[PDB]
Amino acid sequence: VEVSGNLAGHSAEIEQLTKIEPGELYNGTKVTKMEDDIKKLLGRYGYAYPRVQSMPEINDADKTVKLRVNVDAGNRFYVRKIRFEGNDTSKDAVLRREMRQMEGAWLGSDLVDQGKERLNRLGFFETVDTQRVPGSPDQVDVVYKVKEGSFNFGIGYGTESGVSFQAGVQQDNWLGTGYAVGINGTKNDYQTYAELSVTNPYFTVDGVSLGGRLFYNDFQADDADLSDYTNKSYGTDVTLGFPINEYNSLRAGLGYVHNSLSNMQPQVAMWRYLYSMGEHPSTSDQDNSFKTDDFTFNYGWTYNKLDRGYFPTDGSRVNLTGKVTIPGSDNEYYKVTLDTATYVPIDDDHKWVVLGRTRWGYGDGLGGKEMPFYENFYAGGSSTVRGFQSNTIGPKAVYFPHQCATQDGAKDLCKSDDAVGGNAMAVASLEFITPTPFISDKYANSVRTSFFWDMGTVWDTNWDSSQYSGYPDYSDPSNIRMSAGIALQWMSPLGPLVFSYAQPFKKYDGDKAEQFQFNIGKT
Amino acid sequence: CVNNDTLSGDVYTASEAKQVQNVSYGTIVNVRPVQIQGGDDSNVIGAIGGAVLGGFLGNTVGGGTGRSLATAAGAVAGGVAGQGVQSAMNKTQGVELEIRKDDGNTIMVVQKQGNTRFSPGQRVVLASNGSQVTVSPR
Amino acid sequence: CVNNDTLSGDVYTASEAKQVQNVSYGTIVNVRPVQIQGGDDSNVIGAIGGAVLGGFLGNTVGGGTGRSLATAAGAVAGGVAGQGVQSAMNKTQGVELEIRKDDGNTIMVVQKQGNTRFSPGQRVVLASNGSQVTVSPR
Amino acid sequence: CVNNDTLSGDVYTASEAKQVQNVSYGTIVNVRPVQIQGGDDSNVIGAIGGAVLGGFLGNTVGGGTGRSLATAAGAVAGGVAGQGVQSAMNKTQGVELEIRKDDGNTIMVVQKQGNTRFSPGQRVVLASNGSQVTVSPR
Amino acid sequence: CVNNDTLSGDVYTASEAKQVQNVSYGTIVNVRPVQIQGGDDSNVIGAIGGAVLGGFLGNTVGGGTGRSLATAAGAVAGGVAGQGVQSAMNKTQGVELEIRKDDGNTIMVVQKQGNTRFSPGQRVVLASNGSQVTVSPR
Amino acid sequence: CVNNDTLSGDVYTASEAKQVQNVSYGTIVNVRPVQIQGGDDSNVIGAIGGAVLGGFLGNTVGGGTGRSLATAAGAVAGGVAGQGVQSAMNKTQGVELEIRKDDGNTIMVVQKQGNTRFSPGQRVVLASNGSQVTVSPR
Amino acid sequence: CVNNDTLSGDVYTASEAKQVQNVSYGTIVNVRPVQIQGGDDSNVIGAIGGAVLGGFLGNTVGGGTGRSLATAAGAVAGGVAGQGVQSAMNKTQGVELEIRKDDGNTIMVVQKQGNTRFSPGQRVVLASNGSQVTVSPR
Numbered sequence A: 001v002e003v004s005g006n007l008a009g010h011s012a013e014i015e016q017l018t019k020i021e022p023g024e025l026y027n028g029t030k031v032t033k034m035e036d037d038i039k040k041l042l043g044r045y046g047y048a049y050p051r052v053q054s055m056p057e058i059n060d061a062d063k064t065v066k067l068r069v070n071v072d073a074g075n076r077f078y079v080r081k082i083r084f085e086g087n088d089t090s091k092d093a094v095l096r097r098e099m100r101q102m103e104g105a106w107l108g109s110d111l112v113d114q115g116k117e118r119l120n121r122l123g124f125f126e127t128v129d130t131q132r133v134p135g136s137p138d139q140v141d142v143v144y145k146v147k148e149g150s151f152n153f154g155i156g157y158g159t160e161s162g163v164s165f166q167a168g169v170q171q172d173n174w175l176g177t178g179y180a181v182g183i184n185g186t187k188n189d190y191q192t193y194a195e196l197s198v199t200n201p202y203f204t205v206d207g208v209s210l211g212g213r214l215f216y217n218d219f220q221a222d223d224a225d226l227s228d229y230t231n232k233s234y235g236t237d238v239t240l241g242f243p244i245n246e247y248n249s250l251r252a253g254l255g256y257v258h259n260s261l262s263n264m265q266p267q268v269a270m271w272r273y274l275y276s277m278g279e280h281p282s283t284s285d286q287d288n289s290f291k292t293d294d295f296t297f298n299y300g301w302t303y304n305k306l307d308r309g310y311f312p313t314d315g316s317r318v319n320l321t322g323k324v325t326i327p328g329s330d331n332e333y334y335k336v337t338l339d340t341a342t343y344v345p346i347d348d349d350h351k352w353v354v355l356g357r358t359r360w361g362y363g364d365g366l367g368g369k370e371m372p373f374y375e376n377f378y379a380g381g382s383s384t385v386r387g388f389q390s391n392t393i394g395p396k397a398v399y400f401p402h403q404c405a406t407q408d409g410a411k412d413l414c415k416s417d418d419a420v421g422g423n424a425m426a427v428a429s430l431e432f433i434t435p436t437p438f439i440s441d442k443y444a445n446s447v448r449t450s451f452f453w454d455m456g457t458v459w460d461t462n463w464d465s466s467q468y469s470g471y472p473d474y475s476d477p478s479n480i481r482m483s484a485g486i487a488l489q490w491m492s493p494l495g496p497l498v499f500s501y502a503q504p505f506k507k508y509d510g511d512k513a514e515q516f517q518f519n520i521g522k523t
Numbered sequence B, C, D, E, F, G: 001c002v003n004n005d006t007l008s009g010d011v012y013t014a015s016e017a018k019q020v021q022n023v024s025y026g027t028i029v030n031v032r033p034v035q036i037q038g039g040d041d042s043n044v045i046g047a048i049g050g051a052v053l054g055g056f057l058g059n060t061v062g063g064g065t066g067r068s069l070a071t072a073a074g075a076v077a078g079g080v081a082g083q084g085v086q087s088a089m090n091k092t093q094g095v096e097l098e099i100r101k102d103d104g105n106t107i108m109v110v111q112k113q114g115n116t117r118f119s120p121g122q123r124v125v126l127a128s129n130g131s132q133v134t135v136s137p138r
């Protein structure tokens, strides 16, 4: 080595911070690092500009390289003002933390080089650009510059609801203040969702996030293979949200829902519920309007670890959510939904992938009253447990003789096999992802496939078998439903695609099946 | 309510306590009174606060479709009046001062109205910072 | 409640303990009393606490539609009073100090009032950091 | 219960064990007592921990609508008390030490109170690192 | 049926229209006929179109398990015969030409057989581009 | 069906047409027969194709669990035999040629056996490209 | 059965036909026989084909719970034997040849044994590529 210049106190530490072993040949990395262990440090001596540049005498005859490290130190310059122009929403506060020299401190260009870049990960700048006090040679600034509502239309097709539309306007900057306002609208066989939504991501300067949701879920049952009941429901929820980890979050809020239960196909499973609340209309005729207004408190949690957003095969994803009313509304209940996700890659080459998503739920009515039936859990279908028709798993209802009708001589509980759902849900599925063959091996690493063994068990936690002999006890703890098969998912300029074929191997009588299902657009 | 009550020389924010401020001296000329706006321009919270109160005061006239009309006209009227009253809650009296530093210059600075009444010709001390200045009278 | 109790010379935060702070000496002139505001601008959380309490207090008047108006008027009034009372929980008496460093200068610093009652003419030991200054008397 | 139990001259964290730290010597002047704050300003946990406990306490009084109002007044009262007791349980007794290094300087450093009772004039050693300094006696 | 129809000197692709191409001259020797293979190495679409047609033909025979066997041997026999026919609809007649450019050299280039019947000894005009060369006759 | 058919001197791919190829000359020695193996390392297409067809041939025996045994033993034996036949239709005859360029050198190249018959001692017109070569006989 | 068949001097990959191969000459010393491995170290395909055929071979014994034990022990035993037998279907004979080029050097290269039998002291015609070498005897 050699030192030629004023280091202000690193003159001897060259062989300790910037050392190599003699005999090592001319390197552009392990000799430049000798330059670059004192090129960044010197902003810890208040020195603003640490300059290290070393130009050896490249000697070839008997091959020694005599390094000559001209290090001249900077000087002690300070942090007066941080100035952003053109942007009416970005703050001088968060755009200080995402840089690494606070206001009122010894300042340097080279040790603010740890700050300028991360400011762009806000997701709203196109560029993130980067002063001695104007005409005064001691105090100094750090400055930046920034360069800164699109419709969207969705049309899909499918098996669970066939046709499917989306259309809504998003504008993630309300007049220059960072509020995220977004609208959405979806229509298909059973529900039509037309929602407005707002958010302020920084309620507190430190991260608290407040969203107020105005939704409307004009739903319908018969087209969705269930039994008969119609729902036009409107409600509004508001939730807080505060970051805690960047691997976590948390939320809490107050949620008011209002439902119009009507047009019910008389049947025991819901007619237990009507009594306990206090409504007993005619037991075989369908002109009845049960109205609920539920206020309900809600909360959640989250976790993210995946490395790649698109076609992810790493990390671990989690979710929790619960809910409970105050005991001062119409129906009183609570609800607990847990979610999981895990993409385990076994080696760096990343062709073997392991995935399995566990989900749990449970609900109950508190003071002896019952969970509303439209809030139950449904299992079986394409998106959760492939092979069995959508919703088809869940202890079936029992139609009354209504107008099972008295024209044919119906005078009892006509046993039915129609899916209704349930209140305790548990779905596991272990999936074992494998390479993509049969296409050119140049690009045979894209179109994903997997073999899967999906289970699903919803039951009525309060269903009776004292009173129903000829029927089984529909609360069996191990009435599992496994299935297997295949399916191919990928990207193409016509949206998200997948095609499937899954054989239902295990099931019980009364459990329908659906071997084949597809997805284009959205499901 | 935006809290623009710290724009005075008789209160301070928590970000300018326990820091070091240089002190200059000056004589004062041309005092004149000025109003001072403050905070948001979008006035989002006044909009919602006036809108819900103009909506739930719409459910109280007429019935049927004649009520569905009132519960929207009242909503929009309340939404506008919300901004019209919130942005009139940030208006604040203030003063604006031109001063000659004994360095030899002339600068002028605007400030919340306080208790002490400035005079055309006095002595003031300029608490300086990273371009933030307060003018105490003495 | 925002903890506006670290702005004194008799309290330190955890990020300024076990660190090296320089020392300088000074003579003091011209102390005057000043109030100190602090925290956010919007009384961030007290607004929600005021709004919910003012909302639930709305159900306790009237019935039918005439209740549902009160359950909103109370929400807006409680929301306003929330901010209006959170800020008044953050004012604090304080002082503004002139000190002549023995180097030959003058600076001012502002600081939460404590127990010691300063005087125009006394000695103080200016603790410095990366541009953070505390003042102690002795 | 934030663990600011590492801020003494008699406890070290895990991250600074089995590492080389320089030694500088010095004598001491002007010990005085000082309190130490440690934690956050938002106190996002004490608020919830007081909120649920103050909320469930509402469900014990009244009935009908009278209950559903007390179960919110209690909730916000518990919310206030949660921060009011969490951030008053992070206070710690501590000391503020002036020391004159033999190198010729004077610096200030502040530490949690332990067992040893320092004196104004004593030999104490500065186990120094990259801007963290602990003052042990002798 | 992927398009090997732009490989002639009597057809151009629209990517290379309204552009400037350099021109050289040449004398021709030793024409001889040569086929051309085009398209992909795998023929992924000749499989699927040949698979399902071979599949649904299986369903026409037998019943029970015996049908389920025939509806599969039909699938892969249809799968092979698919790739066996797509790759045969691209075999296209063509020629390769030795040419002695008037610069004094020799190069050779191969083109889809067209309307003009070349001869061993003639005059040609090479259109040149970024390593795309068409040999028009005259 | 892996398409190793473009390995002759009488077939060109659709990428190596209408591009300039340099011409060199040579004499020929040491022709000997060689086998060309073309395609993938895995044979992961006829492996499934034999697997499915070998599976459905399993359901056709036994009864009950003894059936469900055979409907898998048939699969992997059907699966394994799939590769064993697919890799037997990628074998292609071909030749190895030691050509002396008149530059004064020697190189060797192998090709799929075509219709012309190379001999030890003859004249060949080596056609060259970006490290791709064919050997037409004349 | 990963296609490790192209490691002879009598079979070429399709990836290196119609490419230029340099020729070097040399004499030969110390031929000795060696075995060649090929494929994977983990043998994933043999694992499945052992696991399923060890599982469905468990179902043939017992009933109740002791059925559910054997029908997994058989699966794991089949999984072991799968990797066990796949990696014994790749052990292939081969030779190791040290050869002295006319340059004046020595190298050794390893090949799959074919039909021709090398000798201790002979002439072999090296074909060289981007670090691929083959040995033909003459």
Ligand SMILES: CC/C=C/CCCCCCC[C@@H](O)CC(=O)N[C@H]1[C@@H](OP(=O)(O)O)O[C@H](CO[C@@H]2O[C@H](CO[C@]3(C(=O)O)C[C@@H](O)[C@@H](O)[C@@H]([C@H](O)CO)O3)[C@@H](OP(=O)(O)O)[C@H](OC(=O)C[C@@H](CCC/C=C/CCCCCC)OC(=O)CCCCCCCCCCCCC)[C@H]2NC(=O)C[C@@H](C/C=C/CCCCCCCC)OC(=O)CCCCCCCCCCC)[C@@H](O)[C@@H]1OC(=O)C[C@H](O)C/C=C/CCCCCCCC
Binding pocket: F058, F060, F061, F062, F063, F064, F065, F066, F067, F069, F070, F073, F074, G060
């Ligand atoms: C080539 C040219 C062209 C030819 C192509 C033709 C192909 C298509 C065939 C067309 C016609 C077909 O329909 C014929 C037929 O299936 N005909 C069949 C048909 O009748 P029909 O069609 O109507 O006429 O169906 C009937 C069904 O029979 C039985 O049904 C019961 C339930 O069904 C019932 C009931 O009774 O309840 C019937 C009725 O009641 C009704 O209601 C139903 C109801 O619907 C629901 O159940 O229920 C089952 O009990 P369960 O459910 O509780 O289990 C029972 O399972 C059982 O029986 C359980 C069995 C299963 C285990 C047997 C062997 C396992 C290996 C063990 C050691 C390994 C060696 C190291 O276990 C046993 O049977 C116990 C046997 C003990 C002795 C075994 C020897 C092993 C050791 C030897 C050591 C030697 C050392 C050198 C089952 N046996 C059965 O279904 C049958 C079972 C019996 C065993 C026979 C001996 C085989 C030994 C040779 C192997 C030696 C290995 C070295 O046979 C089979 O599962 C086929 C075996 C498949 C091969 C798998 C092996 C390959 C693995 C590869 C490993 C690398 C059979 O009688 C007929 O078979 C018969 O008529 C037999 C026939 O005439 C001749 C003999 C055949 C045997 C060889 C087949 C191999 C082919 C391989 C293909 C890839």
Ligand SMILES: CC/C=C/CCCCCCC[C@@H](O)CC(=O)N[C@H]1[C@@H](OP(=O)(O)O)O[C@H](CO[C@@H]2O[C@H](CO[C@]3(C(=O)O)C[C@@H](O)[C@@H](O)[C@@H]([C@H](O)CO)O3)[C@@H](OP(=O)(O)O)[C@H](OC(=O)C[C@@H](CCC/C=C/CCCCCC)OC(=O)CCCCCCCCCCCCC)[C@H]2NC(=O)C[C@@H](C/C=C/CCCCCCCC)OC(=O)CCCCCCCCCCC)[C@@H](O)[C@@H]1OC(=O)C[C@H](O)C/C=C/CCCCCCCC
Binding pocket: G057, G058, G060, G061, G062, G063, G064, G065, G066, G067, G069, G070, G073, G074, G077
């Ligand atoms: C070359 C070899 C190739 C093989 C195949 C080729 C040919 C074969 C084809 C046809 C023949 C075959 O079909 C015969 C048959 O199946 N015959 C059987 C068949 O009838 P069919 O043929 O259809 O007519 O099925 C019937 C089922 O029988 C019983 O049914 C009960 C319920 O049935 C009932 C009811 O009452 O509820 C009534 C019934 O009528 C019906 O209604 C059912 C109804 O459907 C539902 O309930 O219910 C179950 O009770 P449950 O519900 O509560 O569970 C019970 O299991 C029970 O009760 C619970 C059982 C299970 C305990 C297993 C744990 C042992 C640990 C081993 C480690 C050693 C040291 C630590 O436990 C017991 O039974 C207690 C026994 C104690 C001894 C166990 C062995 C340990 C020895 C070592 C100890 C250490 C000291 C040295 C079950 N026993 C049972 O199903 C059987 C149980 C008994 C133990 C076997 C003793 C010797 C085995 C030697 C092996 C290793 C030793 C070194 O065995 C088994 O489960 C299989 C055991 C597998 C062990 C594998 C170990 C891993 C290997 C990995 C290698 C690396 C039996 O009648 C027949 O067996 C009997 O009539 C009695 C007979 O004697 C036992 C049967 C033989 C099994 C051994 C073979 C396994 C080898 C591995 C295969 C890959």
Ligand SMILES: CC/C=C\CCCCCCC[C@@H](O)CC(=O)N[C@H]1[C@@H](OP(=O)(O)O)O[C@H](CO[C@@H]2O[C@H](CO[C@]3(C(=O)O)C[C@@H](O)[C@@H](O)[C@@H]([C@H](O)CO)O3)[C@@H](OP(=O)(O)O)[C@H](OC(=O)C[C@@H](CCC/C=C/CCCCCC)OC(=O)CCCCCCCCCCCCC)[C@H]2NC(=O)C[C@@H](C/C=C/CCCCCCCC)OC(=O)CCCCCCCCCCC)[C@@H](O)[C@@H]1OC(=O)C[C@H](O)C/C=C/CCCCCCCC
Binding pocket: E057, E058, E060, E061, E062, E063, E064, E065, E066, E067, E069, E070, E071, E073, E074, E077, F060
């Ligand atoms: C240019 C175009 C050319 C042609 C293409 C399109 C033409 C369309 C014309 C339409 C006419 C149609 O109406 C004909 C028809 O099938 N019509 C059928 C229809 O009546 P309709 O007229 O339509 O009204 O339905 C009737 C019902 O069929 C029967 O149904 C049963 C169940 O259903 C039943 C019951 O419980 O019994 C009865 C029913 O009444 C009803 O009650 C149902 C009820 O719904 C609930 O189940 O239940 C099955 O039992 P299960 O399912 O429970 O097990 C049973 O098969 C069974 O139980 C088991 C079966 C299966 C035996 C497996 C042997 C395969 C060969 C392997 C050899 C190599 C080994 C290494 O076996 C049998 O049935 C008996 C077999 C005897 C011989 C077995 C050993 C052979 C060894 C050969 C070796 C050669 C070596 C050189 C099944 N038999 C049956 O369905 C029939 C069975 C008979 C065997 C034929 C010879 C096999 C060899 C083939 C080629 C030779 C190679 C050298 O065959 C078949 O299923 C077709 C099987 C496909 C074979 C594919 C081979 C793979 C290789 C392909 C190469 C590319 C059939 O009788 C009629 O067939 C008949 O009237 C018989 C008639 O003559 C026709 C026979 C067809 C064969 C030719 C082509 C097949 C190749 C496929 C190519 C894509």
Ligand SMILES: CCCCCCCCCCCCCCCC(=O)OC[C@H](COP(=O)(O)O)OC(=O)CCCCCCCCCCCCCCC
Binding pocket: B047, B048, B051, B052, B054, B055, B056, B059, B068, B071, B072, B075, B076, B079
């Ligand atoms: C900024 C401008 C925004 C304008 C949007 C105003 C929307 C008004 C829609 C009217 C709804 C009628 C519903 C069906 C009629 C019926 O019989 O409705 C009946 C039921 C209950 O009353 P009954 O007891 O009579 O059934 O519902 C209602 O009455 C709903 C409450 C109506 C009042 C809400 C006030 C508007 C919402 C808050 C403003 C949001 C602005 C946010 C801007 C960013």
Ligand SMILES: CCCCCCCCCCCCCCCC(=O)OC[C@H](COP(=O)(O)O)OC(=O)CCCCCCCCCCCCCCC
Binding pocket: E047, E048, E051, E052, E055, E056, E059, E067, E068, E071, E072, E075, E076, E079, F049, F052
């Ligand atoms: C190149 C490899 C392709 C491998 C795919 C082959 C699968 C063969 C499917 C056989 C289905 C039999 C199941 C039960 C029989 C039955 O009762 O079948 C009867 C029923 C329909 O009759 P009903 O109207 O009576 O229900 O179901 C079917 O017939 C299912 C469809 C059969 C034809 C589909 C053609 C094969 C699959 C498509 C090819 C995709 C290419 C993929 C390339 C990678």
Ligand SMILES: *C(=O)CCCCCCCCCCCCCCC
Binding pocket: B001, B002, B045, B046, B047, B049, B050, B053, B054, B077, B078, B081, B082, B085, B086, B089, C076, C080
């Ligand atoms: C800070 O000041 C927050 C203010 C939040 C909104 C306050 C607006 C008061 C409500 C005005 C209602 C007027 C109704 C007009 C109907 C025509």
Ligand SMILES: *C(=O)CCCCCCCCCCCCCCC
Binding pocket: C001, C002, C045, C046, C047, C049, C050, C053, C054, C077, C078, C081, C082, C085, C086, C089, D076, D080
């Ligand atoms: C830190 O100080 C947090 C304080 C949170 C709010 C405390 C004050 C409660 C709001 C006052 C409610 C007054 C109701 C009057 C109705 C007209």
Ligand SMILES: *C(=O)CCCCCCCCCCCCCCC
Binding pocket: D001, D002, D045, D046, D047, D049, D050, D053, D054, D077, D078, D081, D082, D085, D086, D089
């Ligand atoms: C470390 O301290 C973790 C924070 C835990 C929060 C502590 C909350 C204290 C509970 C006080 C509740 C007072 C109830 C008053 C109701 C009137």
Ligand SMILES: *C(=O)CCCCCCCCCCCCCCC
Binding pocket: E001, E002, E045, E046, E047, E049, E050, E051, E053, E054, E077, E078, E081, E082, E085, E086, E089
């Ligand atoms: C351009 O050529 C596009 C290719 C599209 C696929 C071609 C489909 C042909 C399938 C023919 C199947 C014949 C089966 C006859 C039974 C033996």
Ligand SMILES: *C(=O)CCCCCCCCCCCCCCC
Binding pocket: E076, E080, E083, F001, F002, F045, F046, F047, F049, F050, F053, F054, F077, F078, F081, F082, F085, F086, F089
């Ligand atoms: C291109 O050629 C595509 C691959 C062709 C796959 C052909 C599969 C042949 C299957 C033969 C079945 C023999 C199984 C015998 C098991 C007892």
Ligand SMILES: *C(=O)CCCCCCCCCCCCCCC
Binding pocket: F076, F080, G001, G002, G045, G046, G047, G049, G050, G051, G053, G054, G057, G074, G077, G078, G081, G082, G085, G086, G089
């Ligand atoms: C290329 O060779 C791929 C081969 C795929 C695996 C085939 C190996 C057969 C596995 C036999 C399993 C033995 C069963 C033992 C049961 C107790």
